[PDB]
Amino acid sequence: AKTITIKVDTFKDRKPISPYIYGTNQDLAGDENMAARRLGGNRMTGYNWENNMSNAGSDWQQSSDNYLCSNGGLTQAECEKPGAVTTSFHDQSLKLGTYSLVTLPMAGYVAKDGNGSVQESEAAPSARWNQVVNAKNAPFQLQPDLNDNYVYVDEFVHFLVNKYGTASTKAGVKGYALDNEPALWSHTHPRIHGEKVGAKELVDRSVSLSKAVKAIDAGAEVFGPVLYGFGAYKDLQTAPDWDSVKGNYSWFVDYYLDQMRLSSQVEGKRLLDVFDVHWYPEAMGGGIRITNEVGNDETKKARMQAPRTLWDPTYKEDSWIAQWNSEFLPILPRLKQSVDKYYPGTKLAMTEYSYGGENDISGGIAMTDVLGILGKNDVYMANYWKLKDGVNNYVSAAYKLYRNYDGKNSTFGDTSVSAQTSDIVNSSVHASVTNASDKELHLVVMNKSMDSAFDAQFDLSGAKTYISGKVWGFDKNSSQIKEAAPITQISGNRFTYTVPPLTAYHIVLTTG
Ligand SMILES: [Ca+2]
Ligand SMILES: [Cl-]
């Protein structure tokens, strides 16, 4: 039985954990106690706020239909009301106490109807599509004109502010995203924007839309460019003008940051608040990409190690990104380096991600590590995307372990502190307090080994003596968070607890 040593120092590397890293796209079970929700992804590019219609693009028959009404739980009557998909979404955020991030359209057109598949010769402009205009430059209507050929984005923002107040208020919609995965427009939405997006095109569209939004609500946070993945981070998926605009930039991420900073200068207002990427691991194990299916034992092992690509300079995953682009890994410090240099003060968000194995312990353990990692790497917001429909039992378990570990919505602390482990392969560990507490300490620890328990020897540095602890966990036997045996004796702020294979625990220590 191997021993690992874990050192936790509550005085060291204190850093705020943004609550919006506990975020999602699709709501999960409903008891995860999320802090952020996103209305985004492929269906939002061609979503028409006036009639709630949208187009699935290449995900389903290039079909225009009422899917977002159905998915949001609206009645047929509610589906007729302007803005209803978004206002139903935001009402639910208000009920749950979450941030709302709402996607706005930039690819150029939105669904005019719900009449199904759009054929290639019916690409926009045609009877299947309305054109997007960023600024109406006419009086706004709360009941928009349903019979013309236009949707006006600022009129939609005005509608939301009319109903809820501004982003700076308690009830307001706080975030807007500049469409979704623009480097995939030509692939996902060929009937809307069939040409590959240009780098300069993307900036110009983004500046025009951001300015129109900011003119209605200066406090709203604008998120962009909502890049699908590393190919887009590198050169906007081979954008046709990349060689001509790349200059001395290392990758597209830098060009975009610097151009949005320059445009913000000219305009006299910040036009980009949060640099927004999607990250679906390319990490492979047992011949399978971890996001594709649960896989075999080697897939499951690779899934639990893959979170190290986010932070660990020593880790080299099996993927084309690590094979050909390792100088851009680990990815979170590299993104942060760029953002801090090319548009200082811009925040970072990962608005879709998934590690797969949704109903497997590997997927639960990967997520328990990822939520700790995001929290202590200066990520402002992060939103899981369900790659498998129906329940995602072990992903939900990971969220609950951090945000509702006791059934009473008790949570991990708001302040990250230093937690180190002697074995970064078989274990990960994250620690936190709230409001510099010297009375309560939270530790999330996990064993990634499929075969071998370890005895975790904890050495704690704190201002007060911790006297006891309670423990909650999930494992391969049960995705529900179960109370585990308590820690009844702690001597000199050290204690040992055994962590069985494939188990994650949240330990709460108290001074009494
Ligand atoms: Ca209209
Ligand atoms: Cl993209």
Side-chain angles (χ1 to χ4, degrees), residues 470-507:
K470 281 175 175 189
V471 183
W472 290 264
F474 66 82
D475 65 11
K476 69 168 187 201
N477 298 129
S478 185
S479 52
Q480 289 290 99
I481 307 305
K482 288 162 86 106
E483 295 196 77
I487 291 154
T488 64
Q489 265 185 186
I490 301 176
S491 174
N493 270 359
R494 314 164 76 276
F495 72 95
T496 295
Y497 203 80
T498 297
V499 191
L502 300 177
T503 300
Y505 289 134
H506 188 148
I507 303 175

mmCIF file of all heavy atoms in Angstrom, residues 470-507:
data_model
loop_
_atom_site.group_PDB
_atom_site.id
_atom_site.type_symbol
_atom_site.label_atom_id
_atom_site.label_comp_id
_atom_site.label_asym_id
_atom_site.label_seq_id
_atom_site.Cartn_x
_atom_site.Cartn_y
_atom_site.Cartn_z
ATOM 1 N N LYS A 470 -15.074 15.869 8.083
ATOM 2 C CA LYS A 470 -16.103 15.013 7.505
ATOM 3 C C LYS A 470 -15.704 14.776 6.077
ATOM 4 O O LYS A 470 -14.967 15.587 5.492
ATOM 5 C CB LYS A 470 -17.443 15.705 7.581
ATOM 6 C CG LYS A 470 -18.056 15.613 8.984
ATOM 7 C CD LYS A 470 -19.318 16.389 9.068
ATOM 8 C CE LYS A 470 -19.936 16.163 10.453
ATOM 9 N NZ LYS A 470 -21.324 16.753 10.505
ATOM 10 N N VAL A 471 -16.177 13.666 5.510
ATOM 11 C CA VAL A 471 -15.726 13.234 4.191
ATOM 12 C C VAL A 471 -16.950 12.810 3.371
ATOM 13 O O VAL A 471 -17.826 12.096 3.889
ATOM 14 C CB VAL A 471 -14.735 12.047 4.307
ATOM 15 C CG1 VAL A 471 -14.188 11.641 2.932
ATOM 16 C CG2 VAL A 471 -13.564 12.401 5.280
ATOM 17 N N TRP A 472 -16.999 13.263 2.116
ATOM 18 C CA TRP A 472 -18.034 12.881 1.163
ATOM 19 C C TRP A 472 -17.373 12.426 -0.119
ATOM 20 O O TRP A 472 -16.308 12.923 -0.466
ATOM 21 C CB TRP A 472 -18.964 14.057 0.829
ATOM 22 C CG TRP A 472 -19.888 14.497 1.952
ATOM 23 C CD1 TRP A 472 -21.206 14.119 2.143
ATOM 24 C CD2 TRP A 472 -19.570 15.394 3.018
ATOM 25 N NE1 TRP A 472 -21.711 14.742 3.259
ATOM 26 C CE2 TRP A 472 -20.739 15.538 3.809
ATOM 27 C CE3 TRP A 472 -18.434 16.116 3.356
ATOM 28 C CZ2 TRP A 472 -20.793 16.355 4.948
ATOM 29 C CZ3 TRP A 472 -18.478 16.953 4.524
ATOM 30 C CH2 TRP A 472 -19.648 17.074 5.283
ATOM 31 N N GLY A 473 -17.946 11.444 -0.807
ATOM 32 C CA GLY A 473 -17.252 10.930 -1.978
ATOM 33 C C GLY A 473 -18.129 10.233 -2.998
ATOM 34 O O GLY A 473 -19.311 9.969 -2.737
ATOM 35 N N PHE A 474 -17.564 10.013 -4.191
ATOM 36 C CA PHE A 474 -18.170 9.071 -5.143
ATOM 37 C C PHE A 474 -17.079 8.161 -5.696
ATOM 38 O O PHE A 474 -15.876 8.435 -5.534
ATOM 39 C CB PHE A 474 -18.935 9.775 -6.274
ATOM 40 C CG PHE A 474 -18.060 10.590 -7.209
ATOM 41 C CD1 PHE A 474 -17.372 9.975 -8.254
ATOM 42 C CD2 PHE A 474 -17.933 11.972 -7.029
ATOM 43 C CE1 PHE A 474 -16.583 10.742 -9.168
ATOM 44 C CE2 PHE A 474 -17.160 12.744 -7.917
ATOM 45 C CZ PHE A 474 -16.489 12.123 -8.980
ATOM 46 N N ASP A 475 -17.485 7.037 -6.276
ATOM 47 C CA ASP A 475 -16.513 6.032 -6.748
ATOM 48 C C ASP A 475 -17.173 5.172 -7.845
ATOM 49 O O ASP A 475 -18.266 5.534 -8.320
ATOM 50 C CB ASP A 475 -15.978 5.194 -5.552
ATOM 51 C CG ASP A 475 -17.047 4.353 -4.896
ATOM 52 O OD1 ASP A 475 -18.173 4.208 -5.425
ATOM 53 O OD2 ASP A 475 -16.702 3.773 -3.827
ATOM 54 N N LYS A 476 -16.551 4.063 -8.244
ATOM 55 C CA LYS A 476 -17.067 3.233 -9.337
ATOM 56 C C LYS A 476 -18.371 2.530 -8.970
ATOM 57 O O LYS A 476 -19.119 2.079 -9.835
ATOM 58 C CB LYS A 476 -16.036 2.177 -9.722
ATOM 59 C CG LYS A 476 -15.823 1.093 -8.648
ATOM 60 C CD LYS A 476 -15.016 -0.062 -9.220
ATOM 61 C CE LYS A 476 -14.936 -1.222 -8.233
ATOM 62 N NZ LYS A 476 -13.752 -2.070 -8.603
ATOM 63 N N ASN A 477 -18.640 2.436 -7.676
ATOM 64 C CA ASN A 477 -19.816 1.700 -7.191
ATOM 65 C C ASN A 477 -21.063 2.542 -7.156
ATOM 66 O O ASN A 477 -22.165 2.004 -7.296
ATOM 67 C CB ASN A 477 -19.527 1.109 -5.818
ATOM 68 C CG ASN A 477 -18.373 0.117 -5.863
ATOM 69 O OD1 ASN A 477 -17.412 0.209 -5.077
ATOM 70 N ND2 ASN A 477 -18.395 -0.758 -6.841
ATOM 71 N N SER A 478 -20.893 3.851 -6.958
ATOM 72 C CA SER A 478 -22.024 4.729 -6.770
ATOM 73 C C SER A 478 -21.665 6.141 -7.207
ATOM 74 O O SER A 478 -20.713 6.734 -6.684
ATOM 75 C CB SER A 478 -22.568 4.700 -5.309
ATOM 76 O OG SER A 478 -23.761 5.504 -5.238
ATOM 77 N N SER A 479 -22.419 6.645 -8.187
ATOM 78 C CA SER A 479 -22.231 8.036 -8.631
ATOM 79 C C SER A 479 -22.871 9.033 -7.643
ATOM 80 O O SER A 479 -22.512 10.199 -7.647
ATOM 81 C CB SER A 479 -22.803 8.229 -10.048
ATOM 82 O OG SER A 479 -24.137 7.744 -10.084
ATOM 83 N N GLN A 480 -23.802 8.593 -6.779
ATOM 84 C CA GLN A 480 -24.327 9.504 -5.739
ATOM 85 C C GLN A 480 -23.234 9.904 -4.739
ATOM 86 O O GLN A 480 -22.315 9.104 -4.443
ATOM 87 C CB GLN A 480 -25.522 8.901 -4.955
ATOM 88 C CG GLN A 480 -26.740 8.808 -5.723
ATOM 89 C CD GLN A 480 -27.322 10.213 -5.997
ATOM 90 O OE1 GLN A 480 -27.118 10.744 -7.064
ATOM 91 N NE2 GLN A 480 -27.993 10.802 -5.033
ATOM 92 N N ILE A 481 -23.302 11.115 -4.209
ATOM 93 C CA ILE A 481 -22.259 11.560 -3.265
ATOM 94 C C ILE A 481 -22.614 10.977 -1.883
ATOM 95 O O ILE A 481 -23.690 11.317 -1.318
ATOM 96 C CB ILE A 481 -22.143 13.074 -3.177
ATOM 97 C CG1 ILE A 481 -21.952 13.761 -4.567
ATOM 98 C CG2 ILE A 481 -20.990 13.451 -2.193
ATOM 99 C CD1 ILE A 481 -20.762 13.234 -5.378
ATOM 100 N N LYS A 482 -21.792 10.064 -1.359
ATOM 101 C CA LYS A 482 -22.135 9.404 -0.100
ATOM 102 C C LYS A 482 -21.218 9.904 1.014
ATOM 103 O O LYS A 482 -20.044 10.127 0.762
ATOM 104 C CB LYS A 482 -21.976 7.905 -0.247
ATOM 105 C CG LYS A 482 -23.093 7.299 -1.121
ATOM 106 C CD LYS A 482 -22.719 5.899 -1.631
ATOM 107 C CE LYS A 482 -23.060 4.807 -0.671
ATOM 108 N NZ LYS A 482 -24.315 3.990 -1.126
ATOM 109 N N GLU A 483 -21.763 10.103 2.222
ATOM 110 C CA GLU A 483 -20.932 10.384 3.406
ATOM 111 C C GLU A 483 -19.993 9.224 3.665
ATOM 112 O O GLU A 483 -20.442 8.062 3.706
ATOM 113 C CB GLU A 483 -21.810 10.590 4.640
ATOM 114 C CG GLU A 483 -22.695 11.808 4.538
ATOM 115 C CD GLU A 483 -23.288 12.266 5.874
ATOM 116 O OE1 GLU A 483 -22.553 12.890 6.681
ATOM 117 O OE2 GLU A 483 -24.504 12.036 6.086
ATOM 118 N N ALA A 484 -18.710 9.509 3.851
ATOM 119 C CA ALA A 484 -17.695 8.477 4.142
ATOM 120 C C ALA A 484 -17.304 8.546 5.628
ATOM 121 O O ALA A 484 -17.777 9.435 6.360
ATOM 122 C CB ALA A 484 -16.512 8.704 3.247
ATOM 123 N N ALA A 485 -16.492 7.584 6.113
ATOM 124 C CA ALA A 485 -16.077 7.647 7.530
ATOM 125 C C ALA A 485 -15.379 8.975 7.882
ATOM 126 O O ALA A 485 -14.519 9.442 7.155
ATOM 127 C CB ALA A 485 -15.148 6.448 7.887
ATOM 128 N N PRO A 486 -15.758 9.582 9.015
ATOM 129 C CA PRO A 486 -15.193 10.875 9.416
ATOM 130 C C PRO A 486 -13.717 10.757 9.847
ATOM 131 O O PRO A 486 -13.201 9.664 10.055
ATOM 132 C CB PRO A 486 -16.082 11.298 10.589
ATOM 133 C CG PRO A 486 -16.549 9.984 11.199
ATOM 134 C CD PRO A 486 -16.788 9.115 9.961
ATOM 135 N N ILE A 487 -13.050 11.896 9.947
ATOM 136 C CA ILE A 487 -11.689 11.982 10.426
ATOM 137 C C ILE A 487 -11.855 12.475 11.869
ATOM 138 O O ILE A 487 -12.316 13.583 12.127
ATOM 139 C CB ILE A 487 -10.902 12.994 9.570
ATOM 140 C CG1 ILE A 487 -10.716 12.427 8.157
ATOM 141 C CG2 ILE A 487 -9.522 13.277 10.168
ATOM 142 C CD1 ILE A 487 -10.543 13.474 7.114
ATOM 143 N N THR A 488 -11.534 11.626 12.837
ATOM 144 C CA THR A 488 -11.856 12.005 14.230
ATOM 145 C C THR A 488 -10.603 12.448 14.981
ATOM 146 O O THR A 488 -10.689 13.158 16.000
ATOM 147 C CB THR A 488 -12.546 10.841 15.018
ATOM 148 O OG1 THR A 488 -11.625 9.759 15.130
ATOM 149 C CG2 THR A 488 -13.778 10.350 14.320
ATOM 150 N N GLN A 489 -9.446 12.020 14.494
ATOM 151 C CA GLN A 489 -8.251 12.487 15.124
ATOM 152 C C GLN A 489 -7.206 13.040 14.187
ATOM 153 O O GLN A 489 -6.736 12.447 13.173
ATOM 154 C CB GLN A 489 -7.730 11.566 16.240
ATOM 155 C CG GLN A 489 -8.226 12.027 17.614
ATOM 156 C CD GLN A 489 -7.658 11.224 18.769
ATOM 157 O OE1 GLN A 489 -8.048 11.419 19.919
ATOM 158 N NE2 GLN A 489 -6.728 10.328 18.470
ATOM 159 N N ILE A 490 -6.913 14.290 14.516
ATOM 160 C CA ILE A 490 -5.950 15.064 13.795
ATOM 161 C C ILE A 490 -4.984 15.541 14.873
ATOM 162 O O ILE A 490 -5.386 16.175 15.829
ATOM 163 C CB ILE A 490 -6.600 16.274 13.070
ATOM 164 C CG1 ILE A 490 -7.679 15.767 12.094
ATOM 165 C CG2 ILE A 490 -5.522 17.021 12.331
ATOM 166 C CD1 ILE A 490 -8.489 16.880 11.375
ATOM 167 N N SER A 491 -3.727 15.216 14.692
ATOM 168 C CA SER A 491 -2.706 15.601 15.653
ATOM 169 C C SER A 491 -1.662 16.465 14.959
ATOM 170 O O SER A 491 -1.077 16.067 13.948
ATOM 171 C CB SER A 491 -2.090 14.339 16.266
ATOM 172 O OG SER A 491 -0.997 14.660 17.110
ATOM 173 N N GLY A 492 -1.444 17.668 15.499
ATOM 174 C CA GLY A 492 -0.419 18.547 14.952
ATOM 175 C C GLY A 492 -0.676 18.908 13.492
ATOM 176 O O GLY A 492 0.244 19.067 12.710
ATOM 177 N N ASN A 493 -1.952 19.030 13.152
ATOM 178 C CA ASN A 493 -2.394 19.384 11.794
ATOM 179 C C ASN A 493 -1.884 18.419 10.705
ATOM 180 O O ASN A 493 -1.618 18.820 9.559
ATOM 181 C CB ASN A 493 -2.083 20.870 11.477
ATOM 182 C CG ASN A 493 -3.214 21.804 11.860
ATOM 183 O OD1 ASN A 493 -4.246 21.376 12.343
ATOM 184 N ND2 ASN A 493 -3.028 23.121 11.604
ATOM 185 N N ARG A 494 -1.773 17.145 11.067
ATOM 186 C CA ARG A 494 -1.502 16.089 10.096
ATOM 187 C C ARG A 494 -2.485 14.962 10.320
ATOM 188 O O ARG A 494 -2.848 14.694 11.466
ATOM 189 C CB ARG A 494 -0.089 15.558 10.225
ATOM 190 C CG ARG A 494 0.977 16.644 10.337
ATOM 191 C CD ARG A 494 2.287 16.054 10.862
ATOM 192 N NE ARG A 494 3.027 15.292 9.847
ATOM 193 C CZ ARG A 494 2.823 14.007 9.530
ATOM 194 N NH1 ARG A 494 1.863 13.292 10.114
ATOM 195 N NH2 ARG A 494 3.587 13.428 8.612
ATOM 196 N N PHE A 495 -2.913 14.314 9.227
ATOM 197 C CA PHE A 495 -3.809 13.140 9.314
ATOM 198 C C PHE A 495 -3.602 12.308 8.071
ATOM 199 O O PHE A 495 -3.056 12.802 7.078
ATOM 200 C CB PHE A 495 -5.290 13.534 9.516
ATOM 201 C CG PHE A 495 -5.931 14.121 8.290
ATOM 202 C CD1 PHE A 495 -6.657 13.324 7.411
ATOM 203 C CD2 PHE A 495 -5.785 15.480 8.018
ATOM 204 C CE1 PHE A 495 -7.214 13.864 6.257
ATOM 205 C CE2 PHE A 495 -6.353 16.055 6.867
ATOM 206 C CZ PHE A 495 -7.068 15.252 5.991
ATOM 207 N N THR A 496 -4.040 11.037 8.117
ATOM 208 C CA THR A 496 -3.874 10.133 7.001
ATOM 209 C C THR A 496 -5.285 9.636 6.672
ATOM 210 O O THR A 496 -6.101 9.474 7.567
ATOM 211 C CB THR A 496 -2.892 8.967 7.349
ATOM 212 O OG1 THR A 496 -1.581 9.522 7.565
ATOM 213 C CG2 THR A 496 -2.745 7.952 6.190
ATOM 214 N N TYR A 497 -5.592 9.494 5.387
ATOM 215 C CA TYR A 497 -6.868 8.880 5.017
ATOM 216 C C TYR A 497 -6.589 8.029 3.806
ATOM 217 O O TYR A 497 -5.853 8.452 2.908
ATOM 218 C CB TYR A 497 -7.870 9.971 4.612
ATOM 219 C CG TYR A 497 -9.306 9.545 4.732
ATOM 220 C CD1 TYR A 497 -9.946 9.550 5.959
ATOM 221 C CD2 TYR A 497 -10.036 9.176 3.600
ATOM 222 C CE1 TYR A 497 -11.290 9.180 6.076
ATOM 223 C CE2 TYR A 497 -11.360 8.811 3.698
ATOM 224 C CZ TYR A 497 -11.998 8.842 4.913
ATOM 225 O OH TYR A 497 -13.331 8.492 5.023
ATOM 226 N N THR A 498 -7.204 6.853 3.738
ATOM 227 C CA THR A 498 -6.970 5.997 2.606
ATOM 228 C C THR A 498 -7.926 6.367 1.454
ATOM 229 O O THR A 498 -9.100 6.542 1.678
ATOM 230 C CB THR A 498 -7.183 4.519 3.024
ATOM 231 O OG1 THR A 498 -6.190 4.196 4.027
ATOM 232 C CG2 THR A 498 -6.961 3.624 1.832
ATOM 233 N N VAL A 499 -7.382 6.508 0.261
ATOM 234 C CA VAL A 499 -8.196 6.759 -0.949
ATOM 235 C C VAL A 499 -8.164 5.525 -1.850
ATOM 236 O O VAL A 499 -7.164 5.204 -2.460
ATOM 237 C CB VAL A 499 -7.729 8.012 -1.714
ATOM 238 C CG1 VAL A 499 -8.796 8.349 -2.782
ATOM 239 C CG2 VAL A 499 -7.577 9.221 -0.743
ATOM 240 N N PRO A 500 -9.288 4.799 -1.930
ATOM 241 C CA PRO A 500 -9.336 3.629 -2.782
ATOM 242 C C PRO A 500 -9.191 3.962 -4.289
ATOM 243 O O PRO A 500 -9.308 5.149 -4.660
ATOM 244 C CB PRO A 500 -10.724 3.045 -2.459
ATOM 245 C CG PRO A 500 -11.155 3.687 -1.175
ATOM 246 C CD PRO A 500 -10.551 5.040 -1.220
ATOM 247 N N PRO A 501 -8.912 2.963 -5.151
ATOM 248 C CA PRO A 501 -8.812 3.275 -6.573
ATOM 249 C C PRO A 501 -10.097 3.947 -7.077
ATOM 250 O O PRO A 501 -11.176 3.672 -6.575
ATOM 251 C CB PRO A 501 -8.639 1.888 -7.243
ATOM 252 C CG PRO A 501 -8.173 1.001 -6.147
ATOM 253 C CD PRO A 501 -8.830 1.498 -4.916
ATOM 254 N N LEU A 502 -9.931 4.815 -8.067
ATOM 255 C CA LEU A 502 -11.061 5.417 -8.806
ATOM 256 C C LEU A 502 -12.080 6.020 -7.842
ATOM 257 O O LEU A 502 -13.287 5.761 -7.936
ATOM 258 C CB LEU A 502 -11.716 4.358 -9.728
ATOM 259 C CG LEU A 502 -10.770 3.773 -10.751
ATOM 260 C CD1 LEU A 502 -11.449 2.678 -11.602
ATOM 261 C CD2 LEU A 502 -10.147 4.847 -11.655
ATOM 262 N N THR A 503 -11.609 6.842 -6.909
ATOM 263 C CA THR A 503 -12.478 7.483 -5.921
ATOM 264 C C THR A 503 -12.138 8.972 -5.797
ATOM 265 O O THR A 503 -10.954 9.331 -5.878
ATOM 266 C CB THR A 503 -12.250 6.836 -4.534
ATOM 267 O OG1 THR A 503 -12.557 5.424 -4.613
ATOM 268 C CG2 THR A 503 -13.128 7.459 -3.474
ATOM 269 N N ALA A 504 -13.144 9.832 -5.599
ATOM 270 C CA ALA A 504 -12.896 11.250 -5.364
ATOM 271 C C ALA A 504 -13.578 11.572 -4.061
ATOM 272 O O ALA A 504 -14.726 11.157 -3.856
ATOM 273 C CB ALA A 504 -13.527 12.104 -6.520
ATOM 274 N N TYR A 505 -12.898 12.299 -3.159
ATOM 275 C CA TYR A 505 -13.455 12.732 -1.882
ATOM 276 C C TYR A 505 -13.392 14.245 -1.745
ATOM 277 O O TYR A 505 -12.405 14.861 -2.189
ATOM 278 C CB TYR A 505 -12.624 12.205 -0.684
ATOM 279 C CG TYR A 505 -12.742 10.698 -0.434
ATOM 280 C CD1 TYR A 505 -11.587 9.923 -0.205
ATOM 281 C CD2 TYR A 505 -14.009 10.087 -0.308
ATOM 282 C CE1 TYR A 505 -11.660 8.529 0.029
ATOM 283 C CE2 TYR A 505 -14.122 8.693 -0.001
ATOM 284 C CZ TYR A 505 -12.932 7.939 0.164
ATOM 285 O OH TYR A 505 -13.034 6.597 0.440
ATOM 286 N N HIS A 506 -14.377 14.807 -1.061
ATOM 287 C CA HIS A 506 -14.331 16.175 -0.576
ATOM 288 C C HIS A 506 -14.254 16.064 0.941
ATOM 289 O O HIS A 506 -15.160 15.509 1.564
ATOM 290 C CB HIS A 506 -15.609 16.920 -0.994
ATOM 291 C CG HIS A 506 -15.609 18.399 -0.722
ATOM 292 N ND1 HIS A 506 -16.287 19.279 -1.542
ATOM 293 C CD2 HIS A 506 -15.054 19.151 0.269
ATOM 294 C CE1 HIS A 506 -16.139 20.519 -1.075
ATOM 295 N NE2 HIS A 506 -15.407 20.464 0.031
ATOM 296 N N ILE A 507 -13.156 16.564 1.508
ATOM 297 C CA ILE A 507 -12.892 16.519 2.956
ATOM 298 C C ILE A 507 -13.081 17.928 3.516
ATOM 299 O O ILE A 507 -12.534 18.869 2.951
ATOM 300 C CB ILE A 507 -11.432 16.061 3.231
ATOM 301 C CG1 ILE A 507 -11.193 14.684 2.578
ATOM 302 C CG2 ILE A 507 -11.108 16.111 4.769
ATOM 303 C CD1 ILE A 507 -9.735 14.164 2.671
#
